[PDB]
Ligand binder design. Structure first.
Ligand SMILES: O=C1Nc2ccc(S(=O)(=O)O)cc2/C1=C1/Nc2ccccc2C1=O
Lengths: 258, 296
């Protein structure tokens, strides 16, 4: 049933620009850093992991966090309170069975009360003016996958793995739109696993080329090479599991020929 | 909240109600749907989270308009455009005289527009029924109650099964297909189209198995020929009685040849072959459509 694919790809393309957070909001945060943020998403990764949440829920949560921190300065002692509410809202939006509020208080080993979670929820909904249906790298990757002849279990999993790695480092990834990170991750996934490159069919669909993705490829390829040495390791651990065909175990190309 | 003058209760939300009210300063008549919060519970209901975010994303003449969200710590008020009545009620008020094809055609046409819009924006309504459709004195009809709605992805992944009112629920949900999409909203519309004509629910079962059988006895028990994949579905049973397909002119006799063609396409078993709202808009059945007016 592919009668709406293009109307949707176009609509998400419009929204990803309207939902995108401020590229250099961190520089303006007086108390928090990218490093602290990295620790936050890394933690949300294992939290989504402990509760069996959708990867789509992880990406939403990060989108909400970055958008909230785009207009609100937060003290280092509250960053986790924001990330918890953002995760709860993502689950209430995306999950069939969202873990209840107590689970979310518990995972903070009572760093906050149920009251604080609920109020932060209210606050975040306001700051985001209830605009929660944001496009994500996951929504684009899932679409780029239909252009694979034939489907390739490993390519998909590697693409998702790379896409997730980008959630962790605001620098440099906050300067790319989700649809673009998705293209870079799919190409790099594809190339690594099969030797193939960004499909002819996707240039037509997206209008992106290796040339337009190159700036992002370069970065993602680097993150990929340095992945084993990164301070945050919950995504790699995660992608070692059979559920993702242990792709995080695959060896990244020395170069991309570009 | 100060500038509102409540006029009269109108319906019932599950965490509130819906009141007719009139903006004191602008004179605008509105519909207020209050949602109960109260801290120390579970926070804002996920059904409201979805309803509000998705609805804000749906600006169209055939989708009720959400004018504002009055957010308070104790409760949450949704301000909507006002409409005089809903389709069930109106159908009853006509129960003795019938709904004129012009109106039936116009309403279906509009409804297909609102849905094509929802689907064009990756939104599944998932609870289309005559009570959730509103009509005003101008010939307008609109989708309301986006409480069971959800944003979907391309391709779709497994979503909630406990979905769609039984009478308007599609076979792929009743049979447990692990993936269902936009076609389920079309099924609902075909049932409503049928319902507007004859005046009585097309498949009024009272249990899932009874709902299926009532479906099988009209369109025939499905097989691998008609719908590749049935015999393999989760809730399919080889013991199912094999009923023969009932020729379509008997399902909704008052229907012209175009109506039959359109309805038959909206009730296709195989969800990959059942017509989309977009395509349906071009169907010959609408060549003479107009925006008549209700009968109130
Ligand atoms: O005027 C209206 N605006 C809205 C907006 C949203 C809803 S919802 O379906 O509760 O979301 C219902 C309504 C609504 C309604 N208006 C009327 C008038 C007579 C009888 C029933 C209803 C009704 O449900």
């Amino acid at each position: 049933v592919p009668d709406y694919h293009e109307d949707i790809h176009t609509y998400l393309r419009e929204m990803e620009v309207k939902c995108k957070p401020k590229v250099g909001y961190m520089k303006k945060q007086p108390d928090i850093t990218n490093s602290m943020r990295a620790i936050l998403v890394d933690w949300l990764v294992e939290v989504g992991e402990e509760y069996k949440l959708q990867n789509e829920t992880l990406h939403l949560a990060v989108n909400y966090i970055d958008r909230f921190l785009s207009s609100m300065s937060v003290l280092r002692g509250k960053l986790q309170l924001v990330g918890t509410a953002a995760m709860l809202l993502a689950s209430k939006f995306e999950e069939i069975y969202p873990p209840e509020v107590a689970e979310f208080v518990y995972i903070t080993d009572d760093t906050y009360t149920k009251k604080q979670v609920l109020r932060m929820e209210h606050l975040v909904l306001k700051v985001l003016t209830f605009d929660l249906a944001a496009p994500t790298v996951n929504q684009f990757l899932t679409q780029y996958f239909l252009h694979q002849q034939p489907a390739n279990c490993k390519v998909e999993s590697l693409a998702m793995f790379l896409g997730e790695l980008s959630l962790i480092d605001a620098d440099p990834y906050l300067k790319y739109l989700p649809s673009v990170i998705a293209g870079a991750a799919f190409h790099l996934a594809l190339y690594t696993v099969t030797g193939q490159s960004w499909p002819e069919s996707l240039i037509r669909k997206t209008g992106y080329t290796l040339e337009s993705l190159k700036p992002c490829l370069m970065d993602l390829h680097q993150t990929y090479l340095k992945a084993p040495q990164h301070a945050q390791q919950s995504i790699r651990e995660k992608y070692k599991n059979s559920k993702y065909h242990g792709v995080s175990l695959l060896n990244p190309p020395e170069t991309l020929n570009l | 909240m100060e500038n509102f003058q409540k006029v009269e209760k109108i319906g019932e939300g599950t965490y509130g109600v819906v009141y007719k009210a009139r903006n004191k300063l602008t004179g605008e008549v509105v519909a207020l749907k209050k949602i109960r919060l109260d801290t120390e519970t579970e926070g804002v209901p996920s059904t409201a989270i979805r309803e509000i975010s998705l609805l804000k994303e749906l600006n169209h003449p055939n989708i009720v308009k959400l004018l504002d969200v009055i957010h308070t710590e104790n409760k949450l008020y949704l301000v909507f455009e006002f409409l005089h009545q809903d389709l069930k009620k109106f159908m009853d008020a006509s129960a003795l005289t019938g709904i004129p094809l012009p109106l039936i055609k116009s309403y279906l046409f509009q409804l297909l527009q609102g849905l094509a819009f929802c689907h064009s924006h990756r939104v599944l309504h998932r609870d289309l029924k005559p009570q959730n459709l509103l009509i005003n004195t101008e010939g307008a009809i609109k989708l309301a109650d986006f409480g069971l709605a959800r944003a979907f992805g391309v391709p779709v992944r497994t979503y909630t099964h406990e979905v769609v009112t039984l009478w308007y629920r599609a076979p792929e949900i009743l049979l447990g297909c692990k993936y269902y999409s936009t076609a389920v909203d079309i099924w609902s519309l075909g049932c409503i189209f049928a319902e507007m004509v004859t005046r009585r629910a097309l498949f009024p079962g009272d249990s899932e198995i009874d709902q299926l059988f009532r479906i099988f006895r009209t369109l025939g028990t499905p097989d691998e020929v008609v719908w590749p994949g049935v015999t393999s579905m989760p809730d399919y049973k080889p013991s199912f009685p094999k009923w023969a397909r009932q020729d379509f002119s008997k399902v909704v006799p008052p229907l012209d040849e175009d109506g039959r063609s359109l309805l038959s396409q909206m009730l296709h078993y195989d969800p990959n072959k059942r017509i989309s709202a977009k395509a349906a808009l071009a169907h010959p059945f609408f060549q003479d459509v107009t925006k008549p007016v209700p009968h109130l």
